[PDB]
Each structure stands twice: as C-alpha cells, then as structure tokens.
Amino acid sequence: VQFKLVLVGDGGTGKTTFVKRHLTGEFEKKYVATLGVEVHPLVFHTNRGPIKFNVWDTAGQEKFGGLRDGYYIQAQCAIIMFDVTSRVTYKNVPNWHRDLVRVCENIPIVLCGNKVDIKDRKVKAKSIVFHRKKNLQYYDISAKSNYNFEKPFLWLARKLIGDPNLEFVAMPALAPPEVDPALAAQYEHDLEVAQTTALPDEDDDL
Amino acid sequence: DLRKLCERLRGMD
Amino acid sequence: IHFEPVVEEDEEVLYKVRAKLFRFDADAKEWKERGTGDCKFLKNKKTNKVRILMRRDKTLKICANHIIAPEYTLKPNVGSDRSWVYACTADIAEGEAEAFTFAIRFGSKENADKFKEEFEKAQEINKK
Amino acid sequence: SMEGILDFSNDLDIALLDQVVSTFYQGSGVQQKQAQEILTKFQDNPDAWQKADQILQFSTNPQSKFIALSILDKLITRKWKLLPNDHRIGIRNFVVGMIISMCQDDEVFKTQKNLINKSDLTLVQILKQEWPQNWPEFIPELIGSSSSSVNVCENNMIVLKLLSEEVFDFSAEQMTQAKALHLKNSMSKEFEQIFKLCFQVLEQGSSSSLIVATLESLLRYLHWIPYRYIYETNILELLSTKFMTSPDTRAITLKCLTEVSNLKIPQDNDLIKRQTVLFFQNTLQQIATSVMPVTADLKATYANANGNDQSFLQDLAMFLTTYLARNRALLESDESLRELLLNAHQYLIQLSKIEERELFKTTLDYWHNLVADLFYEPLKKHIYEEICSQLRLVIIENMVRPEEDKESDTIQLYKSEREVLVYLTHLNVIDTEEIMISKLARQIDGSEWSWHNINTLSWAIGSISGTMSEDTEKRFVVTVIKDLLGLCEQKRGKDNKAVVASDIMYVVGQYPRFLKAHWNFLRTVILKLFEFMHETHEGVQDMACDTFIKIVQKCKYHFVIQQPRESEPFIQTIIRDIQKTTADLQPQQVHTFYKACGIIISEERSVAERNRLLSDLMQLPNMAWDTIVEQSTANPTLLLDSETVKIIANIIKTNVAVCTSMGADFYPQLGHIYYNMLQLYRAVSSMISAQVAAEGLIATKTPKVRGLRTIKKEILKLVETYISKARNLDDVVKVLVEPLLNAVLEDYMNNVPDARDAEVLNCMTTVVEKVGHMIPQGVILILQSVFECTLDMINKDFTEYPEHRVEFYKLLKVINEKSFAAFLELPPAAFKLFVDAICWAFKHNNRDVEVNGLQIALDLVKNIERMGNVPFANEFHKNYFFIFVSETFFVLTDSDHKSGFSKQALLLMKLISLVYDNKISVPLYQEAEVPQGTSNQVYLSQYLANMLSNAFPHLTSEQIASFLSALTKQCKDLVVFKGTLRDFLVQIKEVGGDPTDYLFAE
Ligand SMILES: Nc1nc2c(ncn2[C@@H]2O[C@H](COP(=O)(O)OP(=O)(O)NP(=O)(O)O)[C@@H](O)[C@H]2O)c(=O)[nH]1
Ligand SMILES: [Mg+2]
C-alpha cells in the first residue's frame, strides 16, 4: 500500500528538513544541500489502515540537480515547496510545476509555503494564487513550528485512497519490556556528556 | 443612561 | 408493529503533562528532538506496572514507550531549569527495544518538578 | 559491478544500463542509492550524448530511453552550436524518426506516453535552435502528416502545445529578448495554418484523446493569439456547447473559456458583445442540463470528492468569477438576460458554501469585486438584492477568527470577510441586523448553540462596527449584549460560561463609539475586566488584559478627563488599586497593564499632571528598584540569586512597556533610574564575565547567565526604545549618550565572542540614527569598539552569529548614511576591511544581509562622489573601483544571488556611469600598463573584456565586446540595462550565442 511522492522546489526552501521532521521528529538547523535525490519511506497510521509514502526528496540547487525530471517518473503524488521569506522561490513555483506535470500529467499535488514561523514574511498570503488554476492544494506550513506540518500528507492520503473521511489514528502501544553491570560505567560516560551539552532552543515555549 | 445593562453586566460570573 | 431500524485501554492515567522529548546523538554530540505532545504515566491494571507513553501531536505517532524503571535517575541539564536527563535501556517507540539517553523539557520549572515527583512515585509503584 | 557503464572505452552494455536503471526506480535502500549515484555520473559525462542513439534503438527500458533524452536535452540546450553540422542533422533525424515509429505502433503509443512526451519536448528543444531558419517546412509537413494518422495528429498537438509553451509562456527567463521575439514572430507567421488544423479536428474528430489534446493546445494558444481567431470562427459555439457535454473534454474546455473571458476584445463592437453573452449563455445551459441544476448542494458534492468533481467545481468558480468580473455589465440591462445573470451568481452562492479555505478565498475575492461596485455604481444594487441577502448569511456563518480573539492566513481572510460584510451592511443595514439577531436567537434557543458557532457570530457582529447609524448601533449593541448576558447566565460549567464571556468582551471591544458615549457602561466594562484579572481559568486573564488595552487605545481620552459624576479622572482610580488589580497576573500581563496606563497618561498634556501620574504609576517598580539598588550594591552576590535576577528583569520590562506607549514623555522616569541602571549593567556584565571564566563558554547556556544577560538586553531595549522616540535630542546627546557608550562599548569589545550581545549593535544603530549627526566623536568610538571584533566573528562563514551578522550591517549602513566622516577617519587598513566587509555582504544568500550590503556599496559610491576631486576620492577609485565592479559582476553571474539582481544591476549601472560621465578625475590604470592619455572609458572597456574572457572562456570576443558596448551605452536606462544583463545571463549558459542579440534595444 505504497505511493511514490516526489518533493520539489528551490534550494533552501526546507524540503529535507520537512521530511526529516516526519521521519524522526527532529528539526535540523544546518543546511546540507541534497545531492540528486534521497528516498525515504514514510508510514502513517489511518482509520483505513497504514499508508506508506516513498518520498523522493529531490535537490533544488541546479548544480546538484542530478537526474532532475528523471526523478518524477511514475510518481503518484507530489509536493511543491517554496519559502514565504524568499520571493524568488515562489516566482520559480511555475517552473517546478511545469517540469513536474510534463512527466506526471494527472496526480494530486500540494503547494506548500514553508517557514511561516519567521516574522518578516515576504510572500504575502494575498499573493499566493498560482494553485487556483492548477487545482493544487495549498498550505501555509512551518517545519520549525510544525504549523500544518501534517496537512500535506493527510490531504494526499485522502486523494490517493479515495476516502475524504480518512483520518490519522494512534498506532497501538504495546507493553514495553522489563529492564548488565558490565556497561554501568559505560552509560555513565554517555550520561555525563549528555548532561553537559545544553538543550537547543531553550527560549522556545516548550 | 443605561442602568439596567450596567447592573446586568456587573453580575456576570 | 415492529419496524426494523436502518442498518492501551487496560491502563489508567496517573499523570499527564505536555513536554518535548530529546534523544542524544552521541556520535554528533547533539541533542535531537524526538517528539512534542502529551507525556503520560500509564498504570497497567493487570500488572500494576507504570510506563511512560508519549505521542506526537497530529500524527499521534509514538515517541516514547518504556517502563519507569526503579533504577533510572533524573538529572538536570546544564542549560535548563525545566528539563530532566536520564538513561533508558529499553524503549520501543520505533521497533526493536533499544537504549537511549533522553531529555524531556516542560513549559515551566513547576511542571518539571511535578514531573520528577510523579516520576518517583511511579518508580516505587513499580518497586512492588 | 554496476559501475561498468561508466567505462566508455568499452562498448556500452545496454543490459547493464537497464539493470542500474531498474535498481534505481524499482529498487530500494543501498542498491537504489548506489545506482542513483551511478546514473548521475553517467548522465553528466560530456560524451554520454554520443551513446544516446544506441540506447534509444537497442534498449527495452523506457526509463533508460528517458534518461537518454535528458542527456540529449542538456546537449541541445547548452552545446548545440558547438557541434559539427553532421551531428546536428543526425540528432534531429533520429529524434524525428523515433517519434514517428512510436506513433505508428498503437501498443507503444498507448503504453509509453511518458517517453513520447519526453521525445516531443526534446524535438521542441531542437526547434528552438533550428526553426524556422534551418527548418522552414516543419509546420507544413506537420499539417500534412496529421491527416495520414490519428496517433500522429494527436502527438502533433502535444508538440504544438509544448512549442507554444516554450516560446510564449516560459521564454522570458530562458532566452534572449531577440531570440524570444524571433520565435514569437515565427509562430505568429504560421499560426493561420495551425489554427485551421486545430479547428478541423475539433469540428470533425471522433477520438476523444485527439480532441482533448487539441483543446489542451488551444488553451496555450489563447494566451497570445489575436482575438479574430476566437470571435470570427464559431469556435466559441463548439467550446460552449459540444465540448461542455462530454466530461472527457469538459475540464479543458472550461479552462479555455476562462481564458477567452480574458481575451483582448474591442468594447465598441456590439456583435462581439453578443458573442461574449452567447458563449456564457450556452455554457451555463450545459451545466444546468448536463452536470447539476442551480439548486444543487455543491458543499455536499465537493465533500464527497467523487471522481473529478472537486477540480470541476474549482474550475467552475474560476470561470464564473473571471467572466463576471469582466462582463457582468453585459447582462445587467437586457431584461432577457436577467435570469442568466442571477443563475450564474446563484451558482457562485452555492460554490461559496463549500468547505475549502482556498476556494472560498477565490469566490470571496469576486464578492468583494461585486459589492464594491454595487456600493458606488448607480442603479445596480437592486438587481442583486436576493444574491446579497444570501451572501450575508454565507459570510456571517463562515467568519474566521480575528487576531483580537498566531495565523497570518486566518488574519488576512478575516479582513477580506470584514470588508465584504461592511459593504453588504451599507447596502442593506436592516437585512444585516435581522440576520444577526436571528442567528443570536438560535444560540439562545440551543438549536445552533456551539462554542465555534457563538464565536463565529460574535466575530461577525464585531466586524461591522462603524457601519450603522449611532442610534441603530446603540439599539443593536444593547440587544446583542443583553442576549449574550442572558446566554451566559443560561449556561453552567466553567468552560461554557467562559466562551460566552470572552465573546461579550470581544463585541464591546469592537464598538468604541458606543463606549465613548456611555461612560457609566465603559466604566462597568473596565471594572468587570479587572474582576476577570483574578480569574484563574485558562485564558481568562489573557482575554481581560488584551481587551483592556484594546479599549484604552480607542477610548483613552475618557480615562484622562474628569467625568460628570466623578471626583477624579478614572486613570487616577486605576493607579490607586493597581497592585490589587494585577496581583494574580503573570509578568507579561502586568506589563501589558502598565503599557495601557502609559497610553492614557500620554493623553494628559499638562506636563506637571502627566509627570505626577507617571511617577504614581511607576511607584511599585520604583520602590522594588530602589531596594535592589541599595542591596545589589552592598552585596553583588545577590545577583547570583535567580529570584532577584528575575525581579530585576521584570522591573526593566515594566519600564520598557510604559516607555513603549509614552515615548518622549517617558523621560522623567528614565532619569529616575538611568545612572543606577547603567551601574547595574556594568555589575551584571562583570558577573557574566566571571562566570564564563570559571565555568567555560557553556556558562552562556546556563539559566543563571541567561537571566543575567536578559537584564542587559532589557536595559539596551529600554534605552533604544526611548531614544528612537525622543523629541529633545540635546538631552539625549548631553545626558544619555556618553554614560551609555562608556557602559556598553568596552564591555562588548573585551568580552569573548560567545558573550557579546548583538543587542548592543541594535542599540547603537538607533543612537546613530537619531543623533549621529551630533556626536561625530561618539560614532568614531562606536566603530573602534565593534567594527573589527564583530567582523572577525562573521567573516569565517555565513553561518555563525546570525544576529550579529544582521545588526552589524544595519549599523554600518546607518553610520555610512549619517556620519560618513567616521569612515574617513579610519586608518587605511581598517577602511580596506570596511570594503572587504561590504563585498562579504554581497555573497550572503541571507536577504537581511545581502540587501544592506548592496545599499552600503551604493551609498558609499555616492558619498565618495560627493567629495568631488579630492585625494581621498581619487585614491578610493584607484584602490577599489574595479574591486566593486568585479565583485558586483560575480554575484550577478554566479546564479546563487538572483534575489538581489535588481540592486546589483543598479550598483553596476552607477559604477559604469561614473566613467562614461568622466566623474573619476584620475586614470584608473597604472602609469605603466596603458598609453598616456587613454580615457578611463577605453580602459574600463578593456579591463571588463579581459575579465569576462577569463571568467567565461567559452564566449567569443565578439559576444563580450557587443555585450559591453550595449551595457555601457545603456547605463542611464535601468530597465534596458537590466534586460541586457538578463540576455548576458542566458548566453553564458550556452555556447555560440548571437552577439547581435545585444542590439535588441537599438
Ligand atoms: N525558520 C525556519 N527554518 C527552516 C524551516 N524549514 C527548514 N528551515 C531551514 O532552511 C534551511 C534549508 O533546509 P533544507 O531542508 O536543507 O532545504 P532543502 O529544500 O532541502 N535544500 P536542497 O533543495 O538544496 O536540498 C535549513 O537551515 C533549515 O533549518 C522552517 O520551517 N522555518
Ligand atoms: Mg534537501
């Protein structure tokens, strides 16, 4: 029950950070440019069973584009990403869309404006209208604050399964196991280090 | 002058 | 006249608090977020054993599931007055059992201290 | 093993290629990853294109052929003209033949559409290079071959679609102005023959797949073709009747008609007017008879999401809104068209009930267009009275949260909804009132009671404030409050009663005109808010405080005067009981309260009364302050008590809050604490430093040091806040600045990097902005203390110290604006660092650095220019003119700084114009390297030609020379200049660019 998802957009828009957040829950602060593509399975638990996305996280920097539209072959869904703090990334949305629907002529596509957590927003809500004539779903998202971070996958799941009432549900939680002295001083090393490495974002509300 | 409303508002809670 | 008409629960919640969970990536000397959501202490009615169960908001995916073992010890983190660090030997949030060094942060120092209280009460419940 | 296809000495094993490809596309994990890297290395081999013909003939994997065409694509678009003319003909011939043979095989044509589409696009890339000059027969031969086969005719429609896209829709970025125009004229010249084929297919064709492909190409044509092809050919009849009946063609046809509704048409011709009416009439008729009637529940249909219904309803909304925004006047006078007009709008009403945020915004934009016109245009509003009545209910029931009850999408949507609903209220005040009262009755009678529903209605009621007459407003507001009050009583339980109370205070906060005229009521409101500031239910306290300051902002005057039946201005009463009122509030909420009081106090224009109120308001923080100063001084160890640290910070934050609303009037309070505050700043600084020495850099992460630094940051913010609003700048300069600089500059310079507060830079930026002209020695001292040490923090990468990075260049920018003399006093080595720092800013992607970096460069050039012909300016040009020219060219051409193109262009144009206006007095060249008397213009032209030759060695000398001739000749016309730069950016991406392209402006 798996669907190929291609994720495209300008470099630095947050495509990889978005996926990482869904894979591990982590927020990566470093910008390490994707080279070509990185494929990651991503599973969600729904009232219609589990759905598996094979996410093709492609590169947005042209010098790292790899196979480019070659990555789009046989995609069944897609996310186009831009950065609401960078006008040029929205200006390039029609270009990514062009290259995408030439390979994938009839697939559900979500348009995402990332980084809405940033106060000085440059691509204002009233300017974002490209999705209208192209029948794309649009969401304001932030991989950093998790604002709407589940919406793109929930909408795509509903389109791919053909059930508008599909919902994410809680995976069942098995009883956890019960709890050697040969690693006592071993785990005390690792704990000392962890205690003395400050936690990040200590001003965040949580 | 709106005495009745002031009293009515004053009693909320 | 008859007209035919038209055609984890075995547990009790001892404590619930909002929290952000971190796992320590030792090879990168970096704390990494694992999930933000409701952290719960769940007491199994059949074994009376208390566990921690934490789910991420929205996706509801499990980011912590392990017994509040009596030998675990909560320690402060250098950069926070509202977090606890402790080692975990068997957490099953993501498949096979596995050990982690966790950190859990809360909205206030008061929630952090209350969590430590509840955490120790549960250890003694697990003692018997 | 898989890496064998990367060895080009051996023949290419097609079978080994197909395995690498299959493992990539259908494999997983490590295998897929390794294959991915192999395929990328293969595709990027500059000779891989030679093995494309092999792959296309002898491979059985369509993904492999696709990648072969991608390799060919790169070669055609970048190196076509470099090839021997042998290969150009050869590549063209086996792309043409490959397409013919895929079309002739009904099995391939049916099952390899991705590969055919890729092949068609590749063909189009050849046409952009070769057609029509080296392929004049392409179009006549395309038309001839269309009749000999349905599959070939269909595919030709795909080729024509892609060609139209590449020439008209996506050329602006990707080709030179000259080349784009050449191709647009070429397509325009032969479109008569293209349209004839397309129309014949549409009138006769059977194959729906051929029809759909033809209409998809028509959609692209409509972006640019003249109106005569649309209005003089009966094609509108076909689109609006025939093709609206079959669902296969209905989606594309509707998109075509949407574009037609934006065609450039003459507005004199009565017959074109009738044709525009007619195709709308036909389309609406087909929808009513073939899709759904006007009464249909489109909300339910959209929610069911059967088939393509959602896309169809989206397209219908776009069609109706587009057409009606342009042409509804055509329907408003003829009584025989009234039914069509109102049915079209009734469909829009039904579309407006769909639960889909983005679709609602599309219809809401149209409703705004309509009600605005009905509000200004005579004799129109009676036509739409029934439409508008339904719209009132739709908008009231879908009102979203205003920011006064964090989401910028919801905020924008509320304001758009408010705007439409205000127009609708003016259009019929009585109908609006009736709907709202009625909706409220059903909140009381429980039939529509709901937390969401009562919030929604209260937002709607609050949004129309200022549209009723004062008498009607008064009667309306009273009824609403009464009904809400009884509704709050009616409930039980905390949560329920809490919702209704919030909505009550929200509604009243929205009607200040009412509050202003009913003092007794306003006072009762405030005093009820004060009662709520002791309630502990989650969110009540926040609501009470937000409402308090919201009311104060609008009604402040009534708190500062003495009212009829009062012994004192009400502000005096608030202040007396402030400790009691705020005893249960969190610090943030206390500060909002004090800020609200500051707003009132600023309305008092008697100075002595204003100052008395000020010192009365600040009595509690001032007494806590005095206590701590007397202690902290007598036992500096107290500041290690995190409780005293927190107390101190909250005192300062209270001063910031009050200073925020009082501005220049805050000065007397600032004077009460100023000197001791800066002493506190020093003592806190010593402790931060002592802690970092004893514990290491990790101390900066600890709560204790973070608490200490908060003190420093709030102090800086307080001074920044006051100085940015001060009106007496003599006092700023003579009382505030010098103690400030002694307290902050040396502490910043002599702390380790991880301990320096970027807020210091921000504070200094405000000081320079407001009084920089009056403290030239003070500015020099700022530079000496922060310039070099901050630059060394941020000149190793673009990552570290992001806040210092931004504030650093904001400071240099203001200094360069207001006190340029400070840079003249720099030693030459430090001025050289200043130039390096500007160029460093160029290379940031970070917009908050790049933009200031380019503005400093521009302002610096103007500063130097203003000096006239003096030694410093002449040395500047000799040392740095070409550094700025070449650094600007680098970011213009490196493809990683496209966000700053416009300002890079401006800077470059300014630099070039200096020389071609002989505004540089000395030669820019060595006495050695050029004949004496050579003009700087000749030298500049030579320097740049040599620079670009070495930076872009694949350009011909003719290209470079023509580009520079155009560029310098156009250095007084920014738009043309920029076009010439964009043309250059296209040509550097390929080989063999036409140098005459740069004569486009000529
Ligand atoms: N403030 C903020 N920063 C974000 C957000 N999402 C991503 N970032 C940051 O943006 C930068 C780029 O992230 P990244 O995921 O690598 O973008 P990308 O689209 O994958 N780049 P590429 O296409 O080159 O692989 C990172 O520093 C990341 O932390 C966000 O939602 N808010
Ligand atoms: Mg990436």
Author numbering:
A (entry chain A): 9 to 187, 190 to 216
B (entry chain D): 456 to 468
C (entry chain B): 63 to 69, 80 to 200
D (entry chain C): 0 to 376, 414 to 441, 457 to 1053
Lines quoted from the article behind this entry:
We study three NESs that uniquely match the all-helical class 3 pattern (Ф1XXФ2XXXФ3XXФ4). Class 3 NESs from mouse diaphanous homolog 3 (mDia2NES: 1179SVPEVEALLARLRAL1193) and the cell division cycle 7-related protein kinase (CDC7NES: 456QDLRKLCERLRGMDSSTP473) are indeed all-helix peptides, both forming 3-turn α-helices that occupy only the wide part of the CRM1 groove. CDC7NES is far from the protein C-terminus but structures of longer peptides suggest that CDC7NESexits the groove after Met468 or Φ3. The mDia2NES and CDC7NESsequence patterns should thus be Φ0XXΦ1XXXΦ2XXΦ3. The Φ4 anchor position is clearly not used in mDia2NES and CDC7NES even though Φ4 is key for activities of several other NESs. The number of Φ anchor residues necessary for CRM1 binding can vary between 3–5. Because most previously studied NESs have substantial helical content, we also study five NESs that match class 2 (Ф1XФ2XXФ3XФ4) and class 1b (Ф1XXФ2XXФ3XФ4) patterns, where the hydrophobic residue positions do not suggest an amphipathic helix. All eight NESs bind HsCRM1 in the presence of RanGTP with dissociation constants (KDs) of 670 nM-20 μM, and were crystallized bound to the previously described engineered ScCRM1-RanGppNHp-Yrb1p complex.
